[PDB]
Design a protein around this ligand. Structure first.
Ligand SMILES: [Zn+2]
Length: 436
């Protein structure tokens, strides 16, 4: 069985465990959304039935982007919500908390151990999209008009993104904005440059001001400039953190261990409190609540606005917030972003190891490695920060792979940092293949 940190029968008892855990937290009201996945329409029935056979009062918001289901769970009567999505699958909020780790296992263990509530629940249809759409239109303040290419990769974002962007005061060139679970074009994953090539060509050919790309369910956004430069989430956060801290002195801003060190200095320089944390949407949201942070972001493309918003990751709202800021600058999006400091960085580096060894390699490094003049963070793998650059090694959670990133202000410092990591991996196992 798959229960991280799948057919009809699986769906029913997942809905059953969720309902039970929601009720145990004193929350009978649960919202339920699905993405564009082909199995969706049918499979949410089983999820809803699981919930109803608990006594839950379900708000069925139909086919929505993931952050619209999060919105529902913030705005409707109940603080519980379930999103059917395969990035179907499940993103779960119970009594305000986005579940993770030993919480999803606490659900599965209800399945096996038969620890489940029983009752006669309720289903209610709710049309949340117009309220979500209006909520954003009312708060966003666009100045100049902008031409934007929008790539939805045939995911569920095309139900609201091109429309909302047009409504914000934009001319939209849609790309693959028809909801199609078959994903007949590139799969909707703006993290991979390959998935951005159609968008880059389209931005250039149509002389647009910006290109935007959404993932399948809309909780991630990718950004390209009017000249086709891909703007990574860490550089995007630089722009957002500047704006957010400008109205909120001392505000905490969270980012993950893969983000450029430049973001630490930048946030501090504007009077904010930078907070480096672990990877993963659940872990970020949790830290945001713990710290009262106004903004967070992750290298995978999840951006979390609490300021003027609700604090969940929302690719569509983040697009809006981006459009708001760029519309207030006379410069093209290319120059707004290029004005920020830049360093030499590598792409992510993968080393295929084995499932047996991956975590042990990292623990060996945490125990045995020597790092010279370096600040060590072991929040998530081993990250070492030097005055002139930094390096990261972590174990992939889903694949038997070590993941590395390096950044430095110079070509040489890059080498000098890369060299240290190579040596420290070799001290763990001299046979390990270090492809850098
Ligand atoms: Zn997603």
């Amino acid at each position: 069985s798959i229960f991280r940190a799948l057919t009809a029968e699986t769906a029913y008892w997942i809905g059953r465990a969720i309902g039970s855990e929601s009720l145990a937290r004193g929350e009978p009201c649960v919202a339920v959304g699905r993405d564009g996945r082909l199995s969706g329409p049918e499979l949410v029935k089983q999820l809803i039935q699981g919930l109803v056979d608990c006594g839950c009062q379900v708000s069925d918001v139909g086919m929505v982007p993931t952050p619209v289901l999060y919105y529902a769970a913030n705005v409707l009567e109940g603080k519980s919500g379930v999103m059917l999505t395969g990035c179907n699958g499940f993103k779960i909020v119970v009594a305000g908390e986005t579940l993770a780790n030993e919480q999803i296992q606490a659900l599965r263990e209800r399945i096996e151990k038969n620890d489940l509530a029983s009752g006669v629940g309720s289903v209610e249809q709710v049309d949340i999209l117009p309220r979500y759409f209006k909520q954003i239109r009312d708060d966003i303040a666009m100045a100049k008009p902008m031409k934007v290419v929008v790539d939805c990769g045939n995911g569920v974002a095309g139900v609201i993104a091109p429309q909302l962007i047009e409504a914000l005061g934009c001319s939209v060139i849609p790309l693959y904005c028809e909801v199609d679970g078959n994903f007949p074009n590139h799969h909707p994953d703006p993290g991979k440059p390959e998935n951005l090539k159609d968008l880059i060509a389209k931005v250039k050919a149509e002389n647009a001001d910006l290109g935007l790309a959404f993932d399948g369910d809309g909780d991630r956004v990718g950004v390209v400039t009017n000249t086709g430069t891909i703007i990574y989430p860490d550089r995007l956060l630089m722009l957002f953190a500047k704006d957010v801290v400008s109205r909120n002195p001392g505000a905490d801003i969270i980012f993950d261990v893969k983000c450029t060190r430049r973001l630490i200095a930048l946030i501090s320089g504007y009077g904010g409190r930078p907070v480096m944390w672990k990877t993963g949407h659940s872990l970020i949201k949790k830290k945001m609540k713990e710290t009262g942070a106004l903004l967070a972001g992750e290298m995978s493309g999840h951006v979390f606005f609490k300021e003027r918003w609700f604090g969940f990751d929302d690719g569509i709202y983040s697009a809006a917030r981006l459009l708001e800021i760029l519309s207030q600058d006379q410069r093209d999006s290319e120059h707004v972003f290029s004005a920020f400091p830049s360093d030499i960085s590598t792409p992510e580096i993968n080393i295929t190891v084995t499932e047996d060894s991956k975590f042990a390699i990292i623990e060996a490094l945490q125990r045995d490695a020597q790092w010279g003049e370096g600040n060590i963070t072991t929040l998530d793998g081993v990250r070492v920060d030097y005055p002139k650059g930094w390096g990261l090694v972590r174990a992939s959670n889903t694949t038997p792979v070590l993941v590395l990133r390096f950044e430095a202000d110079t070509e040489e410092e890059l080498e000098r940092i890369k060299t240290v990591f190579r040596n420290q991996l070799k001290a763990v196992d001299s046979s390990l293949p270090v492809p850098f």
